């Protein structure tokens, strides 16, 4: 039942059983127009680093660390640089492994990874 997140824009009405985020079982994000202390807003994790174990609420909820919220885990820090302290931020930061293209050993083409 995962539904696409669409920011809520209902003023003068609490995010409770009527906001689209609440109806869609989705946490309110920073792009929602609701109050800054909304019940459905997802809090930013205070992990020391990594954020890859199940203890980190971002990783535990199958979610990448929001740069605006998670500041201790290092997702926000070193935005221009690489080797971020947090590990649940690779999709957002686009730091992907170098793939290589070659004819697959099974069928057709296949992606091969350059480094272990």
Interface map 1-40 toward its own copies (x if CB under 8 A)? ----------------------------------------
Cα angle for residues 26, 12, 43 (degrees, 5° grid): 35
Of residues 3, 31, 32, the one with CA closest to residue 19 = 32
50 binds, among its own copies, Zn ion, none (CB under 5 to 8 A by kind): its own copies
Say how many residues touch Zn ion, by CB under 5 A. Answer: 20
Q: Is 55 within 8 Å of 39 (Cβ atoms)? A: no
Nearer to its own copies, 13 or 55 (CB): 55
Cα separation of 70 and 33, whole Å? 20
Residue 60 makes contact with its own copies by CB under 8 A: yes
The H or E element that residue 59 is part of is: helix 57-60
Which residues within the stretch 50-69 sit at the binding site for Zn ion (CB under 5 A)?
51, 56, 58, 65
CB of 51 to its own copies, least distance (A): 7
């Amino acid at each position: 039942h995962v539904y696409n997140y669409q920011p809520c824009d209902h003023p003068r009405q609490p995010c409770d059983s009527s906001c689209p985020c609440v109806i869609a079982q989705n946490f309110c994000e920073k792009f929602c127009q609701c109050s800054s202390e909304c019940q459905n807003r997802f809090p930013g994790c205070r992990c020391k680093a990594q954020c890859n174990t199940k203890q980190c609420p971002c990783y535990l909820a199958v979610r990448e660390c929001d740069p605006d919220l998670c500041l201790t885990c290092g997702a926000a820090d070193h935005w221009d640089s690489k080797n971020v302290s947090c590990k649940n931020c690779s999709i957002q930061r686009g730091s992907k492994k170098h793939l290589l293209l070659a004819p697959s050993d099974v069928a057709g083409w296949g992606i091969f990874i350059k480094d272990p």
